[PDB]
């Protein structure tokens, strides 16, 4: 398929790049905060237990 309107390989490459970007942002947060569970979004139950313990 030598189409000029659709480029599926670019779509797949963009999906992979977006996944890499998300992983990099997660590691950036985990470094600058020093916490693997810095908010309710990271893990709700363990974050709740930590808030109660603190």
């Amino acid at each position: 398929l030598n189409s000029i309107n659709t480029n599926a390989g670019a779509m797949i490459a963009l999906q992979n790049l977006n996944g890499t970007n998300s992983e990099l942002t997660t590691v950036q947060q985990r470094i600058n905060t020093g916490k693997k569970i810095a908010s309710a979004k990271d893990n709700g139950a363990i974050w709740a237990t930590a808030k109660n313990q603190s």
Binding site: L1, N2, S3, I4, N5, T6, A8, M11, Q15
Partner: protein
């Protein structure tokens, strides 16, 4: 997002042409049109031979 990409790829598979095939079909039809013009030009002159008999 992945589903939207898949739907776009499906539409592209459904309507888009394989332009590498028409890259050859175009030259083939141009040469064919030239041969057709020459053949029609030869065929038009059949009546001219009648004058020689008189």
């Amino acid at each position: 997002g992945k589903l939207q990409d898949s739907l776009d790829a499906g539409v592209g598979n459904l309507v888009d042409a394989d332009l590498a095939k028409e890259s050859a079909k175009l030259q083939s039809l141009q040469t064919k049109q030239q041969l057709g013009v020459q053949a029609l030009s030869i065929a038009n002159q059949s009546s001219s031979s009648i004058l020689s008999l008189f």
